[PDB]
Design a protein around this ligand. Structure first.
Ligand SMILES: [Mn+2]
Length: 258
């Protein structure tokens, strides 16, 4: 059976962020993920994890000015020192939370020169890989989709696999969010099979409405069986927006809880 991590940025929003750790643990999650811890003290989040017996599975490096529309800078020429400084900040939190996996966001690159962007991506990902390797931490690239994130740098799975091969660092891989993969690429069983050994994290949400993985066009129980068949033993992040109250939606998770 796969192991599932509650996404505390999208789930349990009935309560403030710090209260979500307890609710996830009481719902039977052993792991959590979220986008950004940076508005909270690392020591406080560490204590949330310890007190509620939770593993920190994933979070993102600083994205730049989110309020101003920034969605990362890994692929934006000229922001390299900024990106490098943000790796230090992400590493501080990753060590505090004993987190082994970090997503480095690439940015909105529409209207920029594609070759310059890809070159900057490679340099930045190599730097991150080199800084994180001593700590056994992996950095990920996550393809998004053009409906939810128009103009984003990377929106196709095998293209991302190709970019990672160019990076040429063992602690770099793809974050495979099946919601995004279904919207942009499709052919998910054969895609997972082609990508086997090249993705270190998986995320799920219904398609097209991004709710619990028990509705919509994908048969998620089948896809769980595919992940198992290929020997995936990472975590599966629940990055969905609950239809209603978070816990009222958790029947799908009943077979997997604890
Ligand atoms: Mn995602």
């Amino acid at each position: 059976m796969p192991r599932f991590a509650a996404n505390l940025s999208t789930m349990f929003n009935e309560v403030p962020f710090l209260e979500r750790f307890r609710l996830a643990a009481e719902a039977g999650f052993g792991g959590v993920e979220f986008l950004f811890p940076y508005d909270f003290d690392a020591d406080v989040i560490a204590r949330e994890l310890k007190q509620h017996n939770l593993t920190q599975v994933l979070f993102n490096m600083p994205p730049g000015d989110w309020a101003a529309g920034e969605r990362g800078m890994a692929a934006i020429s000229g922001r390299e020192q900024e990106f490098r400084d943000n790796v230090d900040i992400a590493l501080h939190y990753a060590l505090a939370l004993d987190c082994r996996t970090l997503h480095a966001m690439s940015g909105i690159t529409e209207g920029l020169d594609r070759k310059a962007c890809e070159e900057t991506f490679i340099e930045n990902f190599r730097y991150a890989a080199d800084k994180l390797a001593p700590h056994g931490i992996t950095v990920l690239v996550e393809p998004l989709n053009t409906r939810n994130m128009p103009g984003y740098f990377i929106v196709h799975q095998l293209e991302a696999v190709g970019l990672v091969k160019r990076v040429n660092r063992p602690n770099v891989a793809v974050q495979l969010d099946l919601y995004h993969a279904q919207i942009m690429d499709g052919d998910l069983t054969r895609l997972i099979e082609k990508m086997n050994g090249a993705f270190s994290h998986v995320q799920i949400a219904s398609v097209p409405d991004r709710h619990e993985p028990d509705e919509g066009e994908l048969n998620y129980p089948y896809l769980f069986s595919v992940l198992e068949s290929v020997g995936y033993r990472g975590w599966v992040g629940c990055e969905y927006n609950p239809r209603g109250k978070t816990e009222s939606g958790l029947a799908w998770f009943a077979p997997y809880r604890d």
